[PDB]
Symmetry: D2
Subunit: 393 residues, 4 copies
C-alpha cells in the first residue's frame, strides 16, 4: 500500500458520506460532516475530493447559508491540501426531476435543470475543477411511449451545447464528461453505454470540450467488457475522467470497492490505465476517482476501511500488472499470440485496395487451410496473467 | 395479413436455409436449394433476398462452379422478380477466421479477409444491392490480454476505410452497414452495441458511406431498449438497414420470429419504423429484413410457416400501431404526458445561456415543489398502448 | 372487462401506498391513509387488501396508537367488506435488520426478528388471513466470506419451523409462503428462486404448512421463465399464494403493473392460472395478488389508474387465454405437436426397465433417423398463441 | 503446484476432445483418439477420465466396432491406471433428440431415450464408475405453449425413477446426479438451477440415490452465486459430483478453464470444497471434475496447456484458501463479523415460541436502535480475503 497524493486518488463526498438508505430501508449511519470528510480523506492519502452541488449545499440553503458552508469547506481544503478536480450537479433526487432534468417532458423543469447546471459551472470554475461531470440518471423512461425518442436526444443536445458554449464564453478551463448508465433509476436511461455516450458527443456543436466518465459497474450492468469500452473511449481521445468500483453481475448498481467486483477485469482495467497499450498509443493521465458506497452493514470504521481498500486494491493490482508486462515469458507469450503483430498495418505502405485484391498470394493462391493451423495460444497467455495476479509468478 | 412486395420484406438465404446445427447437435433438416429458396420466398410475398457469399458459392468452388451457380441464381431472380437488396460476406465459419477477419492477430489472415471483402463488393454491385453489411462476429476475444485494444480498433478502421474507398473509387452505389453483437461467437465482440458501432463510424475517413444494421436480438443480449437504440441511429442519420427477430432475454442469440421475443418492444419498434416520431423528424424507408432461424424441432412446413409468420406479425403489429396513434384518447393522453411538449426547445428563440441563468422565474423564483406535483400519467398512457396491441380498443 | 370480488384480486397497502422513494431520490407523493386505501380499492373491484405489520402500525407505535389504528382499519374493512387474505412482516427496513432478521450474524437480532414474526402471526390470525408470507430480503450477503452458508440455512430453518410450530400449536388456520428473490437489497439473497424455495421446504420439520409465494418480476431478475417456475410449484402442490407484476429485464426490481413487462409470459401465466394444464393436473385457487409500484412520475390519479390497470390487464389476458383453448384450430395444433402425447406414460402398464431394454422395437431396432423426421410445428402453435393474444383471431 | 492422483482431478473425453465446432463455424482441430486422451492426461496428473456413451462409441457403431473401441480404451486405462468415476449419456446430439429424450412430446422417442440410458447404466457399472450424471439439455422449450409443464415433470420423473429402480434392482454401486442448466440449447430448460434440481429430487420415488452435479458456469448463466448454490446442495446432502469451469457473465455457455471466469467466486468455491463450513457441517468428497472447452483459437499444444491450467488454477486457489483460514487476523475478523455467532441456535435449549414472545428482553424491551449500531465490518473481512487471493499476504 501507501497511497500518496501523486497517485491521484480522488473520492466523491457522497461515497464515504453515503448513509445507507437503499430501496428497502432507511439509513444505518449518521450523516457525515464535509469538513470531517476532507480531513479524513487527506489523512488517508487522497489527492482530491469531488462533489455534487446538493452534497455540500442543501437545495433550500439561503445565500447566507451557502457562503457559511463554502467558507468552512474552503478552509478545510486549505488546511489539508486537497484539490477539487471534478464537480457535478444533482438532477435526480428532488421530486421535480422525476421525468429528468434536460429531457424532462415539462419545459419549465428543463429550464430549471439547465439553470441549476449553469450556476454550478460557475462554482466548478471557482473551485479549480478541470472536469464537470454529467450523470443523466432520470433521463429515460419506464414505458416506450412516454417519450418522443428523437426530441429526447435534441433536448439532451440543447442542454449540453448550451452548457459547453457557456464554458467557452466565460473561458473556464473546464471540460464536460458524460456518465453512461444503462438503467436505475429509470427503466431505460438514454445514452446507456460508452458507445452511445461517444456517438452522441459527435452530434454536438461543441463536441470538442465534451468527453466521457465511464463507470465500471455501469458497463457491467449491460454485460459489457469495461476494458474494451474504456479502450474505445481512449482510442477516440474522449476518456476525460473515470469512476472505478465493483459490480458482481447484472443487477442493481452495487457500487462496491474497486476490486470487490470482477477481479480479473479490474486487473486489466489497471493494466490499461497504468501501462496503456502493448504496441504504444494513448494513455489516460487524469485522476483515479472512486465512485463506490460503503456497505450498509458496516459502521464508520468500515467507511474509512472501504476508502483505504479502494486505494490498496488499485496499488495491489498496479504492482502485479507492472510485474506481468515486465516478465520475459509474458512478453514472449504475447509475441506467439500475435499481440505485436496486430500493430502492423494490414496493407503494405503504398498498396491500394486494387493492388491487394489482385495480389494472388493474399487471395487467389492463399492456403487458408494452412493459416488455420496456427496455435494463437491465448489460453496459455491468459494463464500467465492470472498467475501474476495471484502473486504466483 | 397478405404481405405484398411493396412492404419490402427481404429475407436472408441462411434464415430459411438454416438446417439446425447448434452447439449441442447436428442439423435436423436437409439443405435448401437456393433456386428453391427464391421461388418459395417470392410465392410468399417477399420483395427480395439477401446472402452471404459462401451461402451461395462454396468456399472451394472453382470459377466454372461459381458461374454455373450464379446463372441458375440469376435466372430464378429473373423468373420471380425478387431484388437482392443487401449482400454480406462470411468472415466467421472457416477455421482461418478463428481470431477474426479484419482484426485477426495474424497479418496474413487480415489481408485474406479484406481481399474476400473487396471481391464480394464487386459481386454486391453486380447484383444491384444498395447495402453491403458487415457483421464482425469473430472480432473480439475470450481473454482480456489476447489483444492490443487500440490496435484492434486501428485494424478494424483500416478494413472498413479500405472497403469504402474501394466503393467510392469504383463508383458503386453501395453503402456499408455495421452489425453490432455484444458476444457469441466470441466472449466479447468489438463494437458490441449500436452506440459503439455509431461512435466507431465517426473515426473513419470515409464515415459518410458507413452506417448501421442493428439487430433486435443483439441489443436485447445486453439488456438494452431496441427502440431506444434504433431511435438514436435514425436521429444520427445512420440507420441504413435493419435485422428484425425475437429474443427472449439475455442468453445465446435465439433468432426467433419477429414478435416471438419481447412483444411490447416489437409493437414500439414497428410504431417507430412505420409512424416515425410524435413531433416529426426522420423516418426509416429501407427494407424490413428478417434475420431469424426456424426452430430445429420443426420440419420444412414450419420453415415456410416461420417465414409467413414474420411478415404476419409485422402487419399485425403495424395495424394496431396505426390504430393506436390515430385514436383521439391516445393523442390526448400524449398531450397530458408532455410528448408534444418535449418537442419545444428549452430556450426561447434568441435567449442566451447568460439570459436564462439570470431569468429569475426559471431559477431564483422557481417553485420546484409545485412543478413536482405534476401527474405525467405515463402508466395510463402505457395502458392505452397495451390495450391497442391486445386488440381491445 | 370489470373486476368483481369473485375475481379474487388482492393488493398490498404498500403498493398503492408506495410514496416514490427510490435509491436516487425522495418520495414524490404524500403518505396514503390506510382507511382511504381500503375504500378506494373497494370501489375499484378489489376482493381484499394485504399489509406488512409496519405498513399499518408504525415500528415505535404506543399501545393506544396501535389500538386506534387497528380500530380505524377494522372499521374500514367492515364498511367496505374487504377481506385480509395475507399479512406479512417487515424484517427489512429498520437498521437493526441490515444483516437479516432470521439469518443475521448477531444472535440477539435473530431472536427479536423471530419475536416480531410470532406476534405478527397472532395479528394475521385475528385479521382472518389464510396466508402468512415470508420475504427474507435482508437474508444474504454482498461478500462471499461474510456468512457460514450451512449455518445461514440452519438459522433460516429454525425461524421458519418455530413460526410453523406456533401455528400448529395455536390452532390457527394459516399456511406460510416463502418468497424468493435472487438479489436486491443484498447482492445475493438466500433461497434465490422458486427451485431454491421448494428445495428448502423439504428440509423443514413442518414443511406441510410451508409453500411458495412466487413473484413474477423476481423470477425474471435471474432470467427464468415465470410460467415454468409456478408450473413446478403447482406440480409439487406448493403454490400457496402468488405475486403478479411486471419486469422488463435482468435489472433492479421494477414492480410494474402486471402485463406491463413481458407480455407473452403474462399471457401464458394467465393461461396456466385460468386453464390449468392441458392434460389436467392441480389448479391454482388463491388470490390473484399484485405487488407492484405506481411509477413515481405519476400523481394520485395515476395510483388508482395503475391499480385499475392491474385488474384490467389480467381480465383482458384471461378473455384471450380462454378464447385460445376454446379454438378448434389451436386444439388441432396441440394434438399435432404432441402436447397431449406428453401426458401418456412412457412405459406400458406393468413393464419394467428390463422389459424395455429387451423390447427390440424400443431400442435395438428403433428407427431413430425416421423418428427424427417428425415436424413438431412448435413455431405455428406459438404464432397461433400470439394471434389470439393480439385479438386478430 | 503439481497435480497428483490424490487430488482427484477428472476430465471428460469431450473436453480436451472438443474439436472447435460452434454455432458460427466448423471444427478447428482434428478428432482426438480416446487412447491418446487417456495417456496424455495420465502424464498431466489426472486421477481419471469421464465420457458420454457416444464420445467413445459412435451412435451407429456395429458390435465388432463397439468391442474394438472398448478393448482399446480399457487397454489404455489398464496401462495408465486411470479410473472412470462418472459416465453419462448423450441425449442431445442426434436429430431424434430435438424435443428432448425423457421429456420429448413423441412417446416412441421417450422410450428409445430411456432404453439408451438403461443400457448405458450397464456400461457405467462395467467401467467401475460411482456416478451416473443426467444432463437433460434438450428438455425444455423455446415457446411457452409447446409443453404441458405438469406432464413434462411427470415424464422427467418416470425416466429418472425407472433408471434408479434399475440401479437398485441390479445391485449396482451407482448414484444419479442431475445437472441443471437454465437455457441453451433450448430457450428454457426444465430444472434450470440447483434449487430446481434439489426440489425435483424430493418428488421422486427413489430420490435417496439421486443428487446433483452443479456446474460453475451454468449457475452463473442465470446470474446466481455458485458458492451459495453448492452450499445448499451440501447442506441437503445432495452434492454428488461437481463440474468446474469458468463463465464470464450472463451469455452462452463459455466453458472456460476453472478460474478463467469469476476469480473471487472460484476462490470461495475452492474455500468451500477444501475448508468446508466455518462452524463445521458436511464436506464434499468426490472428484474435482472439469467440464470446459479449450478455446477454438488454440491448436493441440493449447489443449494440454488448458488441461494443465485447470489443475494449476485449482491448486493455486487451494494454497491461498488454506493460507486464509490459517491466518489469525482472518480468524479475528471472522469472530468480529459474527461468522461463528451465526452457528449458535437462536432459541435456548428447550425454549418454545411462547417463551420467546413472552421473554421481554427479546422483544418488548429489546433496544433495536442500540443493536443496529453493530459494525459488522464485512468490507474488511472481504479485503482480507482478496489480499490472501492476490498473495500480498
Ligand atoms: Mn454506480
Ligand atoms: Mn459514477
Ligand atoms: Mn442474431
Ligand atoms: Mn443479423
Ligand atoms: Mn418485487
Ligand atoms: Mn412480492
Ligand atoms: Mn457448460
Ligand atoms: Mn457440465
Amino acid at each position: 500500500v501507501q497511497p500518496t497524493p501523486a497517485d491521484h486518488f480522488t473520492f466523491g463526498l457522497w461515497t464515504v458520506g453515503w448513509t445507507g438508505a437503499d430501496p428497502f430501508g432507511v439509513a444505518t449511519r449518521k450523516n457525515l460532516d464535509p469538513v470531517e470528510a476532507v480531513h479524513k480523506l487527506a489523512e488517508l492519502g487522497a489527492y482530491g475530493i469531488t462533489f455534487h452541488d446538493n452534497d455540500l449545499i442543501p437545495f433550500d440553503a439561503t445565500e447566507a447559508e451557502r457562503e457559511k458552508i463554502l467558507g468552512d469547506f474552503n478552509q478545510a481544503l486549505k488546511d489539508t491540501g486537497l484539490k477539487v478536480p471534478m464537480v457535478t450537479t444533482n438532477l435526480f433526487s428532488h421530486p421535480v426531476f422525476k421525468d429528468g432534468g434536460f429531457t424532462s417532458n415539462d419545459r419549465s423543469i428543463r429550464r430549471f435543470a439547465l439553470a441549476k447546471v449553469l450556476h454550478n459551472i460557475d462554482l466548478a470554475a471557482e473551485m479549480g475543477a478541470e472536469t464537470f461531470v454529467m450523470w443523466g440518471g432520470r433521463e429515460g423512461s419506464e414505458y416506450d411511449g412516454s417519450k418522443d425518442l428523437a426530441a429526447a436526444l435534441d433536448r439532451m443536445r440543447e442542454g449540453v451545447d448550451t452548457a459547453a458554449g457557456y464554458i467557452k464564453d466565460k473561458g473556464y478551463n473546464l471540460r464536460i464528461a458524460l456518465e453512461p448508465k444503462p438503467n436505475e433509476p429509470r427503466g431505460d436511461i438514454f445514452l446507456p453505454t460508452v458507445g452511445h455516450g461517444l456517438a452522441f458527443i459527435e452530434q454536438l456543436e461543441h463536441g470538442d470540450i465534451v468527453g466521457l466518465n465511464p463507470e465500471t459497474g455501469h458497463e457491467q450492468m449491460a454485460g459489457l467488457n469495461f476494458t474494451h469500452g474504456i479502450a474505445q473511449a481512449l482510442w477516440a481521445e474522449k476518456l476525460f475522467h473515470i469512476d472505478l468500483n465493483g459490480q458482481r453481475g447484472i443487477k442493481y448498481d452495487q457500487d462496491l470497492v474497486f476490486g470487490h467486483g470482477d477481479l480479473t477485469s479490474a486487473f486489466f482495467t489497471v493494466d490499461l490505465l497504468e501501462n496503456g497499450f502493448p504496441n504504444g498509443g494513448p494513455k489516460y493521465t487524469g485522476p483515479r476517482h472512486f465512485d463506490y458506497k460503503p456497505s450498509r452493514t458496516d459502521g464508520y470504521d468500515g467507511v474509512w476501511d472501504s476508502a483505504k481498500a479502494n486505494m490498496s486494491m488499485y496499488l495491489l493490482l498496479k504492482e502485479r500488472a507492472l510485474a506481468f508486462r515486465a516478465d520475459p515469458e509474458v512478453q514472449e507469450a504475447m509475441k506467439t499470440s500475435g499481440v505485436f503483430e496486430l500493430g502492423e498495418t494490414t496493407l503494405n505502405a503504398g498498396e491500394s485496395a486494387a493492388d491487394l485484391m489482385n495480389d494472388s498470394a493474399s487471395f487467389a493462391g492463399f492456403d487458408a487451410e494452412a493459416a488455420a493451423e496456427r496455435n494463437f495460444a491465448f489460453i496459455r497467455l491468459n494463464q500467465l496473467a492470472i498467475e501474476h495476479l495471484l502473486g504466483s509468478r
